[PDB]
């Protein structure tokens, strides 16, 4: 059976969680995707010559009960922690998402990547140094992305898979 990597995209409303997932899946930028919709996506990819499947939950932070949400948070192998480089509050919110992950996983060693999205925008209020400093503090990679231009999108998901492989070895 083809190895599957169960991945979970988390972060504040409006950082580009849906746009990043749809760019990876459909290879286009969606300007408009209902902020309250949480759905999973499955995509076959080749990472360093290994054919594998990514099983991705795009989270929406809604209150309504979802058996699927609970399952992915509990059994997810890797987390993308997304903020927007032009949204200081979304960067300030990252510590909350990391705490939620450690608690549901009951582990201090969960594979994670810090994702700074919307790097196409000039109005940057979160600099590369402060993002690299937070990622260093957590012992995780930092990747700059644009869902709009596709800059760093494969790099973000593929780096998370490389972190999961390391954790499995």
**Contact footprint for Mg ion (CB under 5 A):** 17-18
Question: Is residue 150 near ligand GDP by the rule CB under 6 A?
Answer: no
Sheet holding 78-84, edge to edge: 39-47, 50-58, 4-11, 78-84, 112-117, 142-144
Whether 15 contacts 121, CB under 8 Å:
no
Q: How far is the CB of 51 from Mg ion (least distance, A)?
A: 28
- Please identify, using beta-carbon distances, which residue of 6 and 148 lies nearer to ligand GDP: 148
Q: If you ran DSSP here, which 8-state letter would residue 93 be given? A: T
Q: Which of 56, 91, 97, 118 binds ligand GDP (CB under 6 A)?
A: 118
CA distance 108 to 121: 33
b/e map 109-119, b = 16+ CB within 10 Å = ebbbbbbbbbb
Name which of residues 50 to 109 contact ligand GDP (CB under 6 A).
none
Q: What angle do CA 154, 40, 159 make, to 5 degrees?
A: 25
- Please identify, using beta-carbon distances, which residue of 54 and 84 lies nearer to ligand GDP: 84
Q: How far is the CB of 33 from Mg ion (least distance, A)?
A: 6
Residue 69, contacted partner among ligand GDP, Mg ion, none, CB below 5-8 A by kind: none
Contact footprint for ligand GDP (CB under 6 A): 13-19, 31, 33, 35, 117-118, 120-121, 146-148
């Amino acid at each position: 059976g083809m190895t599957e990597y169960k991945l979970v995209v988390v972060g504040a409303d409006g950082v580009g969680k849906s746009a990043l997932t749809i760019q990876l899946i459909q290879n286009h930028f969606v300007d408009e995707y209902d902020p309250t919709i949480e759905d999973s996506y499955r995509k076959q990819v080749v990472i360093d010559g290994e054919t594998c499947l990514l099983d991705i939950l795009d989270t929406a932070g809604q209150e309504e009960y979802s058996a699927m949400r609970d399952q992915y948070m509990r059994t997810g192998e890797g987390f993308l922690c997304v903020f927007a480089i032009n949204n200081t509050k979304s960067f300030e919110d990252i510590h909350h998402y990391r705490e939620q992950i450690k608690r549901v996983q009951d582990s201090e060693d969960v594979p994670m990547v810090l994702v700074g999205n919307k790097c196409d925008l000039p109005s940057r209020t979160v600099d590369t140094k402060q993002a690299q400093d937070l990622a260093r503090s957590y012992g995780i990679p930092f990747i700059e992305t644009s869902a709009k231009t596709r800059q760093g999108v494969d790099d973000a998901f593929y780096t998370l898979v490389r972190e999961i492989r390391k954790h499995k070895e």
